[PDB]
């Protein structure tokens, strides 16, 4: 069901989340080797979220569920603001840059911590 669809696709955002701290360990540590490879393992955690949710929003047009709809398209609208600024620090980190590295890190935090409420409110609409 698309319910369990979400479920599925909200287990694999939290796996992003626990990534991410253990990768913001590691760049406070300076341990670029990990951060690397940290990064590309989130990257492919976004690419499978994204996934799962373009899926479920697919799935929530053809049910005709248009508050579930609504709420999907704001999700995913805020998911690209979150995955512009990760694909940012990922070019900081290849550049060396630490300052744009550290900013993203925070803005990512904070996109993501607001986008929390609305994965909340998705949950029980579909
Ligand atoms: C990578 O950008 C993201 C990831 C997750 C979320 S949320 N907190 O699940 O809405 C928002 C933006």
Redesign the pocket.
């Known amino acids: 069901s698309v319910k369990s669809e979400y479920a599925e696709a909200?287990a694999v955002?939290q796996e992003?989340?626990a990534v991410f701290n253990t990768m913001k360990a590691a760049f406070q540590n300076g341990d670029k080797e990990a951060v690397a490879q940290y990064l590309a393992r989130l990257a492919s955690l976004?690419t499978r979220?994204e996934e799962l949710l373009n899926r479920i929003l697919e799935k929530a047009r053809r049910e005709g569920n248009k508050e579930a709809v609504t709420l999907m398209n704001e999700?995913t609208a805020?998911?690209?603001?979150?995955?512009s600024?990760?694909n940012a620090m990922v070019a900081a980190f290849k550049n060396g840059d630490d300052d744009s590295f550290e900013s993203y890190l925070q803005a990512?935090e904070k996109?993501?911590?607001?986008?929390?409420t609305?994965?909340d409110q998705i949950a029980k609409a579909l």
């Open positions: 909200a955002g992003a989340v976004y979220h999700f805020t998911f690209q603001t979150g995955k600024i990760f990512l996109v993501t911590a607001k986008g929390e609305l994965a």
